[model samples]
Target: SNAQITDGKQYITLDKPIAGEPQVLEFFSFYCPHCYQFEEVLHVSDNVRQKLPEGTKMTKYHVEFLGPLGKDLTQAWAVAIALGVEDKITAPMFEAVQKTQTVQSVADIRKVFVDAGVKGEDYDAAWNSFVVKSLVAQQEKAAADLQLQGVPAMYVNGKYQLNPQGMDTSNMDVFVAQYADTVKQLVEKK
Candidate 1:
């Protein structure tokens, strides 16, 4: 019954989430190997986004469970949100994090943002800015509240459902599509 799991770890509440539409929230961590692999399924290809139902909306929440690794990754994610570059930065960021041979630090993640068209000074400022700090703090609280122990978890319609269990990675695309369709169906039903 309690969505706000811990002190400040607020479970995302969708205000005015399209009446009939289901809201899908994804919990991910940059350092997650499974999340990296799951990207191929979650990546919104041009064709897919184009065909996405009108009322469907997907939001990602990066959870920080892996200490420094999560901090660096979550910073990148929150900075993108703070910069209003979610649509533009999501895929590229995912690829960089997933494909790079070595692990990334905060600086490396910042460089990726820079290369993705974010201005150097702005990136630096945002990475260290109040807005970013607030979001990171919020994420830490949420992780604690949710008792999240892993990455790549999903919550559909505010219910903790639709997770990839047992490392079965092959059907992720179908799962993602099904998740989208479910959102559409819920929206239309309302």
Candidate 2:
């Protein structure tokens, strides 16, 4: 007794569902312009995370295949998450790579964190910590698992991938609602 909640166009099934508790997952890169918009402009990250049902959280995987500094930025993201500074680190990273165009190397990545009020030592320690390394390795493994070729992609319960092409964008709020609804449906899908 199953009904079609998603059209093949709006959401497609994944080959290997994410292994874990049910959750919404996103794959993105700091070097991607639309990924920047998804975080900064659209505010989709917070919106979608907030709209999910209880006990379900939105997770992100930073793909290290975007540009010259892909792997560097990914490690930086992991360090921020490890040190509980992800909220503060997001804007500076996006500005450095996408808008201001200041970040060019690993040193620049460190400066972005330093300017975000992360103490130099704390940032360095986290960067070298096993937890951050483990996080990066997990993200890398997930990237390989997804066999993704694009940025700002979302998945529901690790099985259904959301496609924004067919969504309504005339109203931003409505679009977000629809996106969240699709996720809820997928998360609850049997």
Candidate 3:
């Protein structure tokens, strides 16, 4: 059957299929000014995620190959997810790196969380947790697998990789609306 939406130019079909539930995997980096602009400035990431169909999860893969602080920020992202504080700390992390220029090391990343109301001990516990390490490793491995030219990449069900150029960026609302539509079509494809 023909896909409800057909645009080979818009997405890449992967050989490895996504296991388990339907989800959108976003590859990004805190060191990316563009990611900061998308997530913090325009709120595109949050808005797109919010519009996803029910039962579809959007998982972020923080690539560890962007800058010296990439790995550290990736670990911090994992810890934030473990602590259920990702929504709370995402913008601040982006702000610290791309705008304020305050994050010098992993400690500074932790400070962003601490200042955001996460307890030092709790953050440390999650930081030391094996699951956090595992999650970081997984994101790193995924990034390696993709060998991407750049970030802010989105993959649907881990099979179809969304092309940013395919999105309608002439306006914010229309761009997000189209992005959400493509993701929804891909999610319902299989």
Candidate 4:
């Protein structure tokens, strides 16, 4: 996605490619209640992860702002991604923070990792690693490029910014309908 991309509609394409994954980048903050709700629906429904159209992949980026809550979770998330433990921890972290409300410090975050079957040294190393910090820096830059104004913004294939702030529909059902459709359309063209 090095070339300029634009859609006839309200797509906000990125100016540069990120470290680049399948065809979608999901920008969110764990501190966001909306993201917690969204994560619940996604994890429970088993829709978002299972429905990836053959050739594309999707991953989450913890948007790196919103005080220490954002910073701590973002670092933890980046570390999780680095360890390939992201999929394991997403729900529990949400539960720890949004459900049980126990997450306050990095230690708490590490405990979430430990409870989820990750070893202490693995958790400590990934959480405190320089690589995780670098990934956070990269995420912040990409979030800026996407002009991220709110939580749970999605970019299909590094272009076509989708549904920022519940626009286009009053209900999330319709919202997800359009979101899934948009991702499908973008992936099929290739």
Q: Point to the candidate with the largest TM-score.
A: 2
Clashes (N, CA, C under 3 Å) per candidate: 4, 0, 0, 1
Could you give candidate 3's per-residue lDDT for residues 1-190 as a string of tens digits? Answer: 1234565755667546656523566777788876776788777666767767776676676777789976677777877777677778887777787788988878888888998889888777888899898978886666666445578887777568776676567887776666666777787776
If candidate 1 were superposed on the true structure by all CA atoms, what would the RMSD be? Answer: 8.1
Which order, best to worst by lDDT? Answer: 2, 3, 4, 1
RMSD of 2: 3.2
Estimate candidate 3's alpha-carbon lDDT, on a 0 to 1 scale: 0.73
The lDDT of each candidate is: 0.57, 0.74, 0.73, 0.65
lDDT at 57, model 1: 57
User: Tens digit of lDDT per residue, candidate 4, span 1-190?
Assistant: 1122236442455455465543666777777776776677634124544556765565777775664676677677776787787768888878887799898878888898889878888767866778887888877676666556576666666555654343344776655555455556665543
Q: Which stretches of candidate 4 lie over 4 Å from their true place?
A: 1-22, 42-45, 144-146, 164-175
Q: Each prediction's TM-score against the native?
A: 0.66, 0.85, 0.84, 0.76
lDDT (10s digit) by residue, model 2, range 45-112: 77777667775665666887789887687778887777677768788778878888988878888998
lDDT (tens digit, per residue) of candidate 1 on 1-190: 2111221122222323334323555577665776665565465333234445654456677876655676567776777887777657655666776665344566666766777788887877777788888877866765666445566665445432343442223676564454444333333332
Give the TM-score (vs. native) of candidate 4. Answer: 0.76
Q: What is the lDDT of candidate 4?
A: 0.65
Backbone clash tally (model 2)? 0
